[PDB]
Amino acid sequence: AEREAMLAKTAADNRKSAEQVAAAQADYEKEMAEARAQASALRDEARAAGRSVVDEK
Amino acid sequence: TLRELRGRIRSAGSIKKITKAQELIATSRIAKAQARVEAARPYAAEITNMLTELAGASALDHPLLVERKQPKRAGVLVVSSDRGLCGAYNANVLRRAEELFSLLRDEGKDPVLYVVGRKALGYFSFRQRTVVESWTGFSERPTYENAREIADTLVNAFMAILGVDELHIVFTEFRSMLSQTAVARRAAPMEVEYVGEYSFEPDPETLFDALLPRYIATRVYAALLEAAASES
Amino acid sequence: DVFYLHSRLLERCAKLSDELGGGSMTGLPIIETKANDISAFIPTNVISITDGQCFLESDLFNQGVRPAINVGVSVSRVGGAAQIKAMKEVAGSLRLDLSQYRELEAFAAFASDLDAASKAQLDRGARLVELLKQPQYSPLAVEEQVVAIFLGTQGHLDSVPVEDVQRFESELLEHVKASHSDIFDGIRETKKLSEEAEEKLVSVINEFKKGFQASDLEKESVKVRKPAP
Amino acid sequence: YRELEAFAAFASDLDAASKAQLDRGARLVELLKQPQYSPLAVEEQVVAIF
Amino acid sequence: YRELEAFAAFASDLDAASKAQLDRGARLVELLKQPQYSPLAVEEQVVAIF
Amino acid sequence: TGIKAIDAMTPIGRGQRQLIIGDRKTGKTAVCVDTILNQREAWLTGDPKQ
Amino acid sequence: PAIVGDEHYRVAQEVIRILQRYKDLQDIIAILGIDELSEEDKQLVNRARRIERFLSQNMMAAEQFTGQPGSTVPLKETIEAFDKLTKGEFDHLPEQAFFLIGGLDDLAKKAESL
Amino acid sequence: PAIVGDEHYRVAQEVIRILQRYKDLQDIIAILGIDELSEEDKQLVNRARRIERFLSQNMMAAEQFTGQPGSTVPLKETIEAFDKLTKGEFDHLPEQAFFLIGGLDDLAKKAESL
Amino acid sequence: LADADAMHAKALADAKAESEKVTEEAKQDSERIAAQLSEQAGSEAERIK
Ligand SMILES: Nc1ncnc2c1ncn2[C@@H]1O[C@H](COP(=O)(O)OP(=O)(O)OP(=O)(O)O)[C@@H](O)[C@H]1O
Ligand SMILES: [Mg+2]
């Protein structure tokens, strides 16, 4: 039963090792993309404020 | 203006020549493809007959005859031309393929695509629908090797990787030289139909197992010839 | 003598020699061609009288090419002599490249597959065309123009998707103007892209591209020869 | 030949007689070619067309 | 009908509605046919069009 | 000119003649008026050579 | 854009672009038909036909000819409708629905009729 | 052929024939497409495009048009280059390799650059 | 599996650091673009005056 469980573990874990490497890569990419999107939104808001002050002046 | 009109006249005359030439050559290839359909029919008839005999001497437990317990994935083989100038042929085939996709979705199965022909491949690439595998370069003049390969791939996808619990073939039949309707057929799992009121070597069950893939290959081949005649 | 009318008028536009004060008169005659026919009489007269032509085509104007310069027909016989060294370097062959792109696009309209070189040429040309689009009453200083054409000619737009190219230019030209004005000042004062300035501009473009958001029935049945299951 | 020239691309699908006509014409057209300042006496023309 | 006939001249098959349109038009056109020097009084025209 | 297309592909130099030619409502007057407007920065220098 | 607004100008320019592309494709449409175009161009031509027909309207002065009363479409509704048309939100409706229709609500009415 | 030599004349006439066939085929290509041509005609179209672009040259007086300096192509080199083009020894190079290029050495340099 | 979990933790930490750096750079940008647009506003107002 113990060999059985060891087998189970190895299998699943090597599966979760691959899954966690993929998750690290994907989460890094997704968080970087979210940061870039937030930066783009901030710059768009800055340009909107610039245009608004230009129109006000 | 007159120079442009003369040039347009010359271009239109050249296009007329090319189109008439291809009309006549298309008539020739229609004749040839219909001749090949007729030539292939007797083999299909006889293999169907001995498949019925084997089924009558078989338990009918082969995977390709039993619907999966909970089918969630279904493959679709869309047969299309590899060159244009065929009018609505590809459009009709892919419209029927999309209708089949909608029917499958209403049945809870997401379709997974196999495509024969370049035009359907481009059509699906435009809409970003993944195609597991595609074959091109023979829709005008298919051989049995191509159909055998397609059937082997579909059968392997059915037996299985994630695999598919079911598989359809969408193709344009040739009912008459005036009418070419797109149809969809379920090629696996094959239902069993009872008609009404032999020795085997080495046994009828192994023969049935070896023959069902052959029958699927033969039907895929017949569909390819029908598609070629319809395309012409 | 209508030709002698337009010639007598336009030929007085000249760059006078230093002995006559070194003045100049630049003529931008405007001609309205009927039905997009550049082969008419007066149009051809004025074309032969002038030093270059900008053929604005309605089809291009409707397609999105504003202003609608038919690159193929248009030409400036002064060419590089009427450009600062920077733009002469970053845009030396731009017109011929765009004309070749238009020819390829017309030819490759129905090609099922294309060589990698032809596909790359089409992509570069589309990005250049989008780069050359410009809204009315939105002038760009010469330094901004050389940076914009630098984005396209040098292949820095190759990665940017076509539909976003127009924005990628604008935003970038803002960023530089807001953060790396030294490039613009160098171009304006020296009239050329120094190697150091070119490297700095490439670095700015590559760091900016990081933070840029691109918009991107019947059944086959086995017949069994018996009456019931 | 001038009517069948559109089938130079698909000759393989042509009837044998049509292919023969196309091949004959593609050679008659060459037969009628002639270099400059090299007129042929009538007998030579007869033999050439033969 | 004048355009539906052109469409059907090359359409592989027609829906029931298109078939009905074609069959009605092919009879309306025949109805509007009229021999020379045979004018119809307005009453007969309205009956025929009915 | 202030227009990327003209200054990059068909540059206009001081002393030469650039025919803006096109159909109605193509942007000829827009191009010329933009050229005139683009000279304000040069004008404000106060330098007759610019 | 400084007069009619950014949205109006954008929708007008996109409609003009689609119609110009359709006109440019006429040379092939006349001979080979819609079937032989690229898929992007096929979709463009479909929505171009729908746009071309939606620009049609049932005018009051046309009543004396058609009997159907005329219709008025305010600017905001026109801009919204043509924005949707260009974006492809009505590519599933038949082309016959856009003849002489004048409006989004009445467009839906005729589509339901068909 | 009695003046420029049969070698020059044959290449010139082959180039003229290829370009005339390409001109005739341009009507089909623009509408039907390139893949619908004969294999021989398709290969001839490739040769013809390359020949048209090789007939272009970076001229000395056109440095202002292109910026790059001009070139002088000897007559024998021209004959050899166009003989090869008509025979297909340069069919594998991209089209742009032949554009505004003054001779075979410059053609090879541009091909390696692309 | 331990190394992959450590890799995921490192990826999350580096993602947080990179997001902070990107936000700082974007804030500096936003500030500079705002300053440039304010200068443009002043120039336009003085031209109109
Ligand atoms: N680059 C551009 N971007 C956007 N709109 C433009 C551009 N150039 C011109 N337009 C607009 O297109 C139309 C062209 O008007 P314009 O007077 O410039 O053209 P034109 O060819 O001189 O016409 P006309 O012969 O009637 O005087 C106007 O609506 C103008 O606002
Ligand atoms: Mg004007």
Residue that is written with structure tokens 């993944």 in the block = B130
CA atoms within 13 A on the CB side of H32: 24
Measured from the Cα of C56, ligand 1's closest atom is: 21
Distance from CA of H52 to the nearest CA of B (A): 20
Nearest to C114 by CA among H21, G31, H90, H96: H96
In terms of Cα–Cα distance, which of C100, C65, C184, C147 is closest to H66?
C100
CA-to-CA distance for B116 and B226, rounded, in angstroms?
13
Q: Does G34 contact chain C (CB < 8 Å)?
A: no
Distance between CA atoms of H32 and C33, rounded to whole angstroms?
Answer: 32
Residue C65 has phi, psi (to 5 degrees) of -75, 95
Where do runs of H (alpha helix) occur along A1-57? 2-56
E2 CA to chain B: closest CA distance, Å? 21
* Cβ atoms of G50 and G88 closer than 8 Å: no
Whether C28 and F2 lie within 8 Å, measured CB to CB:
no
Q: Please judge whether G31 and B126 are an interchain contact, meaning their C-beta atoms are less than 8 angstroms apart.
A: no
Which residues of F line the annotated binding site for ATP?
22-29
Per-position b or e across F6-41, b if 16+ CB within 10 A of its CB = bbbbbbbbebbbbbbbbbeebbbebbbebbeebeee
Q: How far apart are the first and last CA of chain G?
A: 37
Q: Does I22 contact C178 at a Cβ distance shorter than 8 Å?
A: no
Amino acid found at G93: L
**Tokens 């845009």, located at residue:** C91
Q: What is the token pair recorded at B159?
A: 């037996």
Vertex C120: Cα angle to C116 and C125 (nearest 5): 150
Cβ contacts of G50 within 8 Å, gap of 6 or more: G85, G90, G91, G93, G95, G98
Residue found by looking up tokens 């032509």 in the block: C53
The Cα G17–Cα G5 span in angstroms is: 18
Beta carbons of C211 and A40 less than 8 angstroms apart: yes
How many domains would you assign to chain B?
A: 1
**Domain range C87-211, CATH class:** mainly alpha
In the numeric block, the tokens 């010469």 are attached to: C142
With touching defined as 3 or more inter-chain CB pairs under 8 Å, the answer for chains A and I is yes
Show the tokens assigned to C142: 């010469």
Answer whether residue B15 is part of any domain. no
Sort out which chain H residues have CB atoms less than 8 A from G28's CB and list them. 31
Hey, which residues does C53 pair with through a beta bridge?
Answer: C75, F19
Is B189 domain-assigned? yes
Q: Which amino acid is at H92?
A: H
Which of H27, H33, H36 is facing B10, going by the closest CB pair? H27
Give residues with Cβ within 8 angstroms of F27, minimum separation 6. C56, C61, C66, C67, C68, C136
Distance, CA of D47 to chain centre: 15
- What domains are defined for chain H? 6-113 (1.10.1140.10)
Across-strand partners of F21? C31, C55
Tell me if B5 is assigned to some domain.
no
d(CA H53, CA C107): 14
d(CA B20, CA H31): 15
Strands, E, within C73-159: which ranges?
A: 75-76
The first and second tokens of residue E15, run together, are 């829906």
Return the closest-CA partner of residue H77 out of H42, H50, H106: H106
Chain A: touching chains (3 or more CB pairs < 8 Å): C, I
What's the CATH code of the domain at B29? 3.40.1380.10
The closest alpha carbon to B189, from B232, B152, B155, B141, belongs to: B155
Amino acid at B184: A
Range of the domain at B115: 21-232
Rounded to whole angstroms, the Cα distance separating H9 from I36 reads 67
Method of elucidation: cryo-EM
CA distance I41 to I26: 22
Chains near E (3 or more Cβ pairs under 8 Å): B
Q: Which two tokens stand for residue B138?
A: 């023979």
For residue G63, the surrounding DSSP H or E stretch is helix G63-66
Which residue, chain included where needed, has tokens 């297909």?
H88
The terminus-to-terminus CA distance of chain F in angstroms comes to 14
Select from C185, C206, C174 the least CA-distant residue to C142: C185
- Which tokens in the block code for residue B99? 């209708």
- The ligand 1 site (C-beta within 6 Å) comprises C 32, 66-67, 134-136; F 22, 24-30
Q: Cα–Cα distance between E5 and B89 in angstroms, integer?
A: 20
CA B67/CA B62 separation, integer angstroms: 10
- C17, two tokens: 């020699």
Q: How far is C23 from chain F (nearest CA, A)?
A: 8
> At what resolution in Å was this solved?
2.8
Query: For C85, phi and psi rounded to 5 degrees?
Result: -55, -35
Backbone angles phi and psi of F17, in degrees to 5: -120, 120
- A10 — phi, psi (to 5°)? -50, -55
Distance CA C12, CA C27 (A): 9
Chain C residues in contact with I35 by the CB 8 A cut-off are 178
Q: In chain C, what residues touch H63 (CB-CB under 8 Å)? A: 80
- For residue C23, which phi and psi values (nearest 5 degrees)? -75, 180
Dist. CA B159–CA B147, nearest whole Å: 18
Ligand closest in space to the Cα of F28: 1
Q: Is the peptide bond before C67 cis (omega within 30 degrees of 0)?
A: yes
Is B104 domain-assigned?
yes
Annotated binding site of F: 22-29
Rounded to whole angstroms, how far apart are CA atoms G90 and G82?
A: 10
CA angle C131, C133, C137 (to 5 degrees): 125
Cβ contact F22–C56 (<8 Å): yes
Q: Please, what sign has the CA dihedral across residues F32, F38, F42, F45?
A: positive
Q: What are the tokens at E18?
A: 């298109």
Domain assignment present for residue B93? The answer is: yes
Cα G109 from Cα B211, distance rounded (Å): 57
CA distance linking residue D19 with residue C151, whole number of Å = 57
b/e per residue D11-42 (b: at least 16 CB within 10 A): eebbeeeeeeebeebeeeeeeeeeeeeeeeee
Of F3, F21, F28, best ligand 1 pocket probe by most atoms within 8 Å of the beta carbon:
F28
Nearest alpha carbon to residue B168 among B81, B57, B73: B73
In a domain, B1, yes or no: no
Give the gap in angstroms from C-alpha A1 to the nearest C-alpha of chain I.
Answer: 23
* CB proximity C221 to H under 8 Å: no
Contact E12, B180 (CB under 8 A): yes
Q: Which residue has the tokens 């047969």?
A: B79
Q: Which ligand is nearest to the CA of F24?
A: 1
Is B52 within a domain?
A: yes
Q: Is E12 on the interface with B (CB under 8 A)?
A: yes
For residues B112 and B168, give the distance between their C-alpha atoms in angstroms, rounded to a whole number: 10
Q: Which of C175, C104, C112, C108 is nearest to C144 (CA)?
A: C175
Distance, CA of B83 to CA of B3 (rounded, Å):
34
Q: Which chains touch H (3 or more CB pairs under 8 A)?
A: B, C, D, G
d(CA C151, CA C214): 16
Scored b (16 or more CB within 10 A) or e, B122-142 reads bbbeeeeeeeeebbbebbebb
Query: Can you tell me whether residue I18 is helix, strand or coil?
Result: helix
Q: Which residue has the tokens 């737009």?
A: C157
Angle in degrees, CA A26, A29, A30, rounded to 5: 85
HEC readout, chain B: CHHHHHHHHHHHHHHHHHHHHHHHHHHHHHHHHHHHHHHHHHHHHHHHHHHHHHHHCCCCCCHHHCCCCCCCEEEEEEECCCCCCCCCHHHHHHHHHHHHHHHHHHCCCEEEEEEECHHHHHHHHHCCCCEEEEECCCCCCCCHHHHHHHHHHHHHHHHCCCCCCEEEEEEECCCCCCCCCEEEEEEEEEEEEECCCCCCCCCHHHHHHHHHHHHHHHHHHHHHHHHHHHHC
Phi and psi for E38 in degrees, rounded to 5? Answer: -130, 65
H or E element in which residue H92 lies: none
Alpha-carbon distance of C169 to C34, in angstroms, equals 35
Q: Which residues of C are marked as active site?
A: 77
C224 contacts B194? CB cut-off 8 A: yes
Residue C81 CA neighbour count, 13 Å, CB half: 14
Q: Given an 8 Å threshold on Cβ–Cβ distance, is G17 in contact with C64?
A: yes
Only one residue has tokens 């129109």, namely A55
Q: Cβ–Cβ contacts within 10 Å for residue B60, how many?
A: 16
Phi, then psi, of C60 in degrees rounded to 5 = -65, -40
* Closest ligand 1 atom, residue F3 Cα: 1
Residue in chain B closest to C219 (alpha carbons) equals: B186
Q: Which amino acid is at I20?
A: E
